[PDB]
Design a protein around this ligand. Structure first.
Ligand SMILES: *[C@@H]1O[C@H](CO)[C@@H](O[C@@H]2O[C@H](CO)[C@@H](O)[C@H](O)[C@H]2NC(C)=O)[C@H](O)[C@H]1NC(C)=O
Ligand SMILES: *[C@@H]1O[C@H](CO)[C@@H](O[C@@H]2O[C@H](CO)[C@@H](O)[C@H](O)[C@H]2NC(C)=O)[C@H](O)[C@H]1NC(C)=O
Ligand SMILES: *[C@@H]1O[C@H](CO)[C@@H](O[C@@H]2O[C@H](CO)[C@@H](O)[C@H](O)[C@H]2NC(C)=O)[C@H](O)[C@H]1NC(C)=O
Ligand SMILES: *[C@@H]1O[C@H](CO)[C@@H](O)[C@H](O)[C@H]1NC(C)=O
Ligand SMILES: *[C@@H]1O[C@H](CO)[C@@H](O)[C@H](O)[C@H]1NC(C)=O
Ligand SMILES: *[C@@H]1O[C@H](CO)[C@@H](O)[C@H](O)[C@H]1NC(C)=O
Ligand SMILES: *[C@@H]1O[C@H](CO)[C@@H](O)[C@H](O)[C@H]1NC(C)=O
Ligand SMILES: *[C@@H]1O[C@H](CO)[C@@H](O)[C@H](O)[C@H]1NC(C)=O
Ligand SMILES: *[C@@H]1O[C@H](CO)[C@@H](O)[C@H](O)[C@H]1NC(C)=O
Ligand SMILES: *[C@@H]1O[C@H](CO)[C@@H](O)[C@H](O)[C@H]1NC(C)=O
Ligand SMILES: *[C@@H]1O[C@H](CO)[C@@H](O)[C@H](O)[C@H]1NC(C)=O
Ligand SMILES: NCc1ccccc1-c1ccccc1
Ligand SMILES: NCc1ccccc1-c1ccccc1
Lengths: 724, 729
């Protein structure tokens, strides 16, 4: 038998995870029941039983143990908002007594909650204001009084900061020992609202209009203010006093963003700010002052990170990792040859020294100790789509050890890591070419303690199914390596001609050719329909240096689009591809590129599917769009904004079969974007197929809609490929 | 060859290869009408037409002239430009006035931009116009206008113009202004939408609009808060530029003010007598008031003795609304189509001071409309000829002798003409007949004194020439017996139709209350193409709920929408397949609006009769459609009325059954009538039960999906879907 659409949609074959949350430097929690595990022995006692909260009445979505292990926070009444944001009810459970607190409870509709990093202090956001609980059963102190729905956000992000800047709803930062609470304040007063209908359940007589403050390209952005409150000197008599830290003079001169918050020590915080033109950012290092109670960020302690060839950072400037004394830090920046490497900074000195070098990139700094910096990179075998954990000796930068490279080179070439509280242990997460493998390691000697999850259950289930394989490789274009992957049908025959589906994203810093094992739609297409599904990382793609990544700076809808067409041409020349049956599909940026490709009039592609595509860049949000496109003004980049629309390519869609799909409640890529594509196609008399999804957002992630869209897409591709 | 090789193609339909010529005229007097070659004044009797306005006269105008309107006295012309469509009847335009005698544009005190309605008095050249929701009157075109109302408020208070629901469902017009016969009085309605909830939807506009617009329209859905209505009459002769105008309120009868009600008809009877019809929100009870002007009061008074009640125990009253009265010259009598004791609609003769009327027509057929009445004759359209409800003829009944009824149009050309409408001159001395009948449309002129044909105005001979060579389809108009009742169907049959072959069939459905889809009208439409080119039979059926056949058939679906009319369409297809020439592996159904709903209900019925179908802008559940139309047939969506059937006749509840059929669902996103909502709820329900189907939204299109480009796209799209459903290459 084969891996079917049903298998994909119903998860017949499930990849087991081994999700753990470190509680200390040698203990971690795991759900089977919730057990505590020992890293030394692997023994486990039950921490809270299957039904410890039986007579609760509510359904528990998640939990959060306080750092000192004295209280547990139960989260229920989960209502998803955007990508990361949501609302929930909360209860505090005294662990020393095993009983829910009933006094001064956390209110319903709480936007964000968090423990302080030590002890059991609590900070939550409710109705856009910040409250603090020193003790779970004591009244909370109100920190901010300016909270206003859709307008002022204290300690939580607005739509655009949530999606594009912090990848989080929270804008609350505890100092390491919980003394200070730092937060951001966002003002959306003059930011225009995107409006769309929400139809809701059949019983709703009149559709509801959703209105979300959302800055599209070149519109009025939110403004940001930054505060730090002392949670140890809180009065129950007077209103708490918040100390503002103003953005540096180089940022105040125009529109800007707060793009990073990172505490260095107990009395030192680092903030990164980004100009609206995102090629200039500044890091301030701010110290708490004694006989003034204020925060001072010495002009001399400013660190500038700018780019001559593009934007700054992969998606934002990278975060700093301070040494314990906070007089030094490490961060990933692109070197003089454009490759992202770790640079070592002195709090006071302008120049940093690079501690990594080469024609590969550091992905992330993972942990810092007294003697070692740990990082993940794609250095192993010059493969940008592999991921390995390396150890770098701080006293000698040349002494670099790959901790994961050789553990299982056959099945594992893509690792992530999770260190214990003080990096004494680490769990390795291999998502590698073979089935995922989760292993525990002692960092003192780098030996492997034990296998946590090996997916042998999946492994034997899969023994009985004709499974596809992955070919990961590169082609040469202009004396440059460009990587691609193919999901090849089972019993693949080089001498026979297969239909090929080109799976595209191709956004700036994207990577679609990697060593990750996946069970997805492509898996079914290859396994059952005998379709090759290819992906390709061309210009604009990430983790290969700025020469490649910055190629599309200010030129979205050009090189990354052309390169996808070129990749398909190269794939025809591999001899096992039926060039009468090449297709392309993508979601979001992938939707855009698919559409741009189908409208290019290249003649390479028979058909395509665009899901929730951007159709023109003025329709998309400011932070993301302007990062690559600049501003849509006559003095900046209007001409290319005007040039890079799918609408302008409508005529060329006469040569191809198109499917356009979009959820009507997409807060991210607004239905508007597809509504304009469809209108333009109609206006030039192009026939095509469409599908809207009522009330689905950008994820089209309802169990039923998810199943419906993939089913619908399968029929379209099978129809396009003459597959019965 | 030399035999017909051509067919009527999809391109022919979309590009208008074969154009039907019309002959639209407008009577100016009792013996002259206007026409357009250039604007001429044809003399009806001789044919001599002197030139009235050359095409060039407005070349220097600087704007494209959408329409024109000559004052009743031919002294002034109204030029309409900057036309901006709103709903089905409503729009906005600029207006200028050209003095026909003085030969130039009036520049002083011009009608403002964004005028909602303009109209001449029926005699002379008084003017009434609505702007910013208020009424203004110009006694002369170049003088300052008199402001009648001061209460107009966008979306809240409408003066002399209807709100959404009154435009669409009650008056079929934007104006709520009615001049008295000689222009002395200007009657108007005033609607109040303060608590009517707003439908809201996105308008995407030109691609240069960065943020979509949200359109907000006061629109009462079934059971919602309705607009209130007040009625006024102002004397335009006693206007002054020193005091504000005095509007005299005419209140509704107490039997109406007791609960929610509507004004459904306004009809002047004389210079000093107006008749109002009012309808209760439960639309089974209506009251006509008849109101004389009082000379000493300066007020209007409706005498309770002259009050007339029209009701129905079986359904609603009127075909879509209570019928309009047609008054005798003295205004002491009127004629009015009402349903007789056995449910057939006929002309009843009423006396102003009397309760009981006398029926002037009888029979198992119906009067469609009263068209004209004189001292000696009443002229009306009916479907009596050959007992064919889908046929239409002009009849003449003698007022002094009801047994003397003459058919004026029946026998003119019986073979090509079986469906007529009429246009009478100002005092019925001449009339134009429009034959749309089985053959090519024919326009003729007549004098009513001797009823002889004066001339052929337009005979569509150019089109007859072009068609002489193309394999056109034929129409079969016949009936079937069901529960010993005749139900009529039509078939657009492919050329060289062969009884022995098995053709695929498309059920073209509408099936709304008082609908008629089986008639004698000649049409060049999508159905023409399907038959001519694709060899598909496209049939239509008038089952229970349909009109022009009596209340027995028409009221069968009262309070029961989505039942018998739906069931009868399914039943029809069974009959068609059992006629022997239908391939019942290939039966499709398609409809728009109510027809979209019926399509959806049929596809979701689980009958197994249909392979596929297309629903365009369908209603999906009655709580989503407007109060006036829905409640007419469905009552209130309340537990103590009809909530049960409201909840029971949604297409959503039938989602599961769509697993058995190929479905295409189409809807314009800016549909102000049947909201996109209705399809959005259908789609969600089909997604929820894992049914695959096909969809197409039309960005910024409304209920008509009428844009040149969109119109062509949807028909191309549907053609592909139907061709693939039927395995047609
Ligand atoms: C959020 O920003 C808005 C817009 O800048 C601020 O509103 C202005 O406040 C000033 C002084 O209070 C007034 O004089 C202006 O007229 C306001 N403009 C508008 C558009 O409202 C608002 O004060 C800010 N709120 C916070 C809490 O910072
Ligand atoms: C802390 O600050 C808040 C908001 O600034 C105060 O609450 C307001 O108090 C003023 C008078 O001082 C009233 O006019 C407002 O109506 C109050 N707003 C609300 C509902 O909070 C609060 O009293 C302050 N606490 C003190 C006394 O320091
Ligand atoms: C339109 O109708 C509304 C009611 O729907 C009228 O508003 C009322 O006005 C009176 C007196 O001004 C108030 O007592 C009521 O509270 C209002 N009604 C409600 C409930 O809103 C309004 O006057 C009408 N408009 C006009 C000018 O006719
Ligand atoms: C693991 O085992 C030791 C005894 O060998 C015990 O003291 C410790 O508490 C255990 N930890 C857990 C997680 O139960
Ligand atoms: C949260 O909401 C529910 C439902 O209204 C209510 O019964 C409960 O008391 C609320 N809990 C809190 C913490 O306010
Ligand atoms: C936390 O840091 C603050 C500020 O430096 C300091 O006063 C305090 O000692 C620390 N708390 C403890 C007891 O760890
Ligand atoms: C940042 O971008 C602007 C606009 O593209 C450009 O003119 C400027 O040179 C850039 N600044 C830096 C510091 O590279
Ligand atoms: C129409 O014809 C009549 C009769 O022959 C003629 O006298 C007249 O000039 C024409 N009509 C007008 C008023 O132009
Ligand atoms: C209508 O608008 C145009 C353009 O704004 C203006 O020139 C013209 O005078 C206006 N017409 C009237 C009669 O107000
Ligand atoms: C007419 O009515 C309005 C308000 O209803 C008033 O403002 C206006 O001045 C009145 N006209 C005069 C001057 O009589
Ligand atoms: C129009 O009607 C009014 C009301 O009956 C009357 O006073 C007036 O004389 C009429 N006008 C003419 C010129 O017939
Ligand atoms: N908004 C940045 C982002 C982050 C994660 C995934 C997708 C996207 C995205 C959506 C739409 C268009 C371009 C990117
Ligand atoms: N609103 C009555 C009407 C009149 C003319 C044409 C269609 C319709 C209509 C639209 C939607 C649903 C039911 C009827």
């Amino acid at each position: 038998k084969t891996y079917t659409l049903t298998d994909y949609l119903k998860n017949t074959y499930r990849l087991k995870l081994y999700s753990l949350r470190w509680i200390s430097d040698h203990e971690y929690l795991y759900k089977q029941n919730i057990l505590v595990f020992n890293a030394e022995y692997g023994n486990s006692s039950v921490f809270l039983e299957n039904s410890t909260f039986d007579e609760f009445g509510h359904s528990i979505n998640d939990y959060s143990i306080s750092p000192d292990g004295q209280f547990i926070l139960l989260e229920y009444n989960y209502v998803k908002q955007w990508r990361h944001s949501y609302t929930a009810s909360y209860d505090i459970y005294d662990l020393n007594k095993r009983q829910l607190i009933t006094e001064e409870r956390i209110p319903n509709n709480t936007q964000w909650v968090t423990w302080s990093p030590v002890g059991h202090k609590l900070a939550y956001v409710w109705n856009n204001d910040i409250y603090v609980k020193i003790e779970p059963n004591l009244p909370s102190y109100r920190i901010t009084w300016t909270g206003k729905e859709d307008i002022i956000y204290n300690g939580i992000t607005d739509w655009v900061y949530e999606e594009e800047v912090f990848s989080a709803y929270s804008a609350l930062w505890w100092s390491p020992n919980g003394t200070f609470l730092a937060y951001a304040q966002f003002n959306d007063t003059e930011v225009p609202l995107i409006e769309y209908s929400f139809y809701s359940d059949e019983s709703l007589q009149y559709p509801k209009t959703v209105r979300v403050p959302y800055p599209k390209a070149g519109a009025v952005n939110p403004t940001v203010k930054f505060f730090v409150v002392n949670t140890d000197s809180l009065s129950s008599v007077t209103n708490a006093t918040s100390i503002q830290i103003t953005a540096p003079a180089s940022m105040l001169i125009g529109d800007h963003y707060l793009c990073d918050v990172t505490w260095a020590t107990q009395e030192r915080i680092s903030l990164q700010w980004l100009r609206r033109i995102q090629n200039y950012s500044v890091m301030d290092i701010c110290d708490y002052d004694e006989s003034s109670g204020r925060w001072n960020c010495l002009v001399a302690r400013q660190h500038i990170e700018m780019s001559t060839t593009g934007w700054v950072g992969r998606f934002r400037p990278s975060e700093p990792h301070f040494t314990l004394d906070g007089n030094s830090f490490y961060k990933i920046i692109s070197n003089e040859e454009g490759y992202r490497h770790i640079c070592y900074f002195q709090i006071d000195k302008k120049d940093c020294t690079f501690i990594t070098k080469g024609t590969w990139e550091v992905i992330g700094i993972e942990a810092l100790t007294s003697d070692y910096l740990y990082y993940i990179s794609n250095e192993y075998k010059g493969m940008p789509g592999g991921r390995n954990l390396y150890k770098i000796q701080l006293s000698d930068y040349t002494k670099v050890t790959c901790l994961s490279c050789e553990l299982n080179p056959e099945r594992c070439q893509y690792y992530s890591v999770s260190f214990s509280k003080e990096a004494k242990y680490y769990q390795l997460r291999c998502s590698g070419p073979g089935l995922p493998l989760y292993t525990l390691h002692s960092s003192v000697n780098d030996k492997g303690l034990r296998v946590l999850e090996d997916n042998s259950a999946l492994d034997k289930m899969l023994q009985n199914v004709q499974m596809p394989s992955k070919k990961l490789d590169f082609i040469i274009l202009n004396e440059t390596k460009f990587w691609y992957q193919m999901i090849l049908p089972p019993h693949f025959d080089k001498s026979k001609k297969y239909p090929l589906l080109l799976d595209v994203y191709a956004g700036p810093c994207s990577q679609k050719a990697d060593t990750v094992f996946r069970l997805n739609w492509a898996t079914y297409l290859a396994s059952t329909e005998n379709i090759i599904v290819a992906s390709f990382d061309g210009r604009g793609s990430g983790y290969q240096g700025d020469k490649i990544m910055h190629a599309i700076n200010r030129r979205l809808g050009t090189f990354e689009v052309e390169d996808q067409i070129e990749a398909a041409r190269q794939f025809s020349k591999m001899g096992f591809v039926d060039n009468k049956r090449i297709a392309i599909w993508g979601w979001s940026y992938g939707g855009y590129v698919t559409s741009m490709v189908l409208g290019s009039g290249s003649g390479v592609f028979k058909c395509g599917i665009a899901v929730a595509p951007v159709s023109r860049w003025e329709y998309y949000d400011s932070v993301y769009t302007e990062r690559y496109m600049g501003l849509p003004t006559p003095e900046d980049n209007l001409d290319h904004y005007r040039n890079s629309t799918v609408m302008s390519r409508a005529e060329n869609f006469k040569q191809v079969e198109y499917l356009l799909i979009h959820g009507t409640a997409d807060d991210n890529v607004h239905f508007q974007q597809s509504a304009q594509i469809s209108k333009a196609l109609v206006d030039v008399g192009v026939d095509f197929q469409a599908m809207w999804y009522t009330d689905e957002d950008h994820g089209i992630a309802s169990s039923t809609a998810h199943q419906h869209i993939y089913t619908h897409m399968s029929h379209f591709i099978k129809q396009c490929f003459s597959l019965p």
